[PDB]
Amino acid sequence: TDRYSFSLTTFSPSGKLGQIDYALTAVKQGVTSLGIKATNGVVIATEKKSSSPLAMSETLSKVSLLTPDIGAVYSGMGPDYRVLVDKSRKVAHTSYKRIYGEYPPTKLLVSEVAKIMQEATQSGGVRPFGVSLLIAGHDEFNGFSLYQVDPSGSYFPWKATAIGKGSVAAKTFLEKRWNDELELEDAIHIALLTLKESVEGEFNGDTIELAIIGDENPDLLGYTGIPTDKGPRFRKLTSQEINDRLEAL
Amino acid sequence: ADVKGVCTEAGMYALRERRIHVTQEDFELAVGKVMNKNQETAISVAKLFK
């Protein structure tokens, strides 16, 4: 049956919450991922990793679209991301796409997935999720915005940040290379450059999954002729397109 | 500690080039090398213990 209705996150005696502390260890075991916020886009970036070359990378995904205006990319455990991406799409429809008829702002959706976090830092028979997500997006009133949702269930707004095993070195590189005007194309050159120093294995347009939240493409809209709506702002970069910008280093 | 390492390390480049005194350029070689060595072990979190 179920008799597990007691929390397994409990207070530790010198203070702190022991499960959430541990779970943050599990975040820093995984891949390295970063995000740079420009003035007209946000770029997010990650490295693919397989068991062998026999795995395909084509069917693999690590950057997902939650809404067309808001994407996510993680560093931490593969399993936990996989379910939590799906719960994120679900609450985004059920609590703002049926109620206010449209996709939710980035501040609002972030706040909902931090509450998904929160109810596995608590309740019985559950431990914390073992990912930390960047949830980058664009809304119409807080601009481009990059967030970091964490195992604690807090969120922080950021302007550029990194998470994963190369986090310590990555952000110092990014502190010194940040500037208060970047274009999205100029943003890319930073993110690739940094992600090249955290890879030591192979480097290709097939092994770096790169995503932009640029500006609107009506070629992914699927249709034309309602000018009220404007196509996916989210646009995952194909292997061919990424490869040119790799040579551009 | 590091400050004292920049002085010994500069004295060691006086030997390398076969100078007779420590020059200012010996300080430029010192500061860089000692720093690259200090920061690598902090940010890679590796020790002198194996």
């Binding site: 995904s61 799409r89 059920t94 049926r98 699927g222 034309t224 | -």
Partner: protein, 226 residues
Amino acid sequence: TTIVGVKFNNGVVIAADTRSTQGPIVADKNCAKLHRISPKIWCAGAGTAADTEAVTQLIGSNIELHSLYTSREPRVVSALQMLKQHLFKYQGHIGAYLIVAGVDPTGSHLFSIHAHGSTDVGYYLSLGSGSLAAMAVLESHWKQDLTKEEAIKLASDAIQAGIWNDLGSGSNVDVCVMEIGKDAEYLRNYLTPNVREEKQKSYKFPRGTTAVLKESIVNICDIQEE
């Protein structure tokens, strides 16, 4: 309020008129009755207005979720299977009468659904209250094999003559053309046959014709500063 769907070789065309009526009174001269279940699956609605909008919305969500969790393009047949189930469990209380047309990876499809959760297939389908009128013109002039210039005419003529043989019809005939391998072409107001006759007398009143018992100001434009 009529909807036509005409299946052709290269895709499928669906067309309807824009007049909403709330009984004898004409509630809106233009209203769009063509809904978007997904990018390649437009539908339109007939029957009660308040009941169509609300469940082409509800499954709009549900099919979108489906499409992202499978990580593959939607099929038409899916939208229809979720819709049939959703209407039958209320046992025909919610009056939906949709004609759901759509391109997907398995050719093109065109379907009709009725309020009890009846579904029929057809290469010409007809629904709404001006159905009977639209059927008559269609059935003379159809034949196998139509291209998009042919088909889009035929849907537009059937709706056009459908206007003058129905009273709940009126205004402009909208068309939406879904080709195979192509982004659907929403040609809003394709044929406009009716235009309001220009009034022979203006009716603009002077200032102060009306009387003012009292007046005052509410300020809610801002929320006041310190």
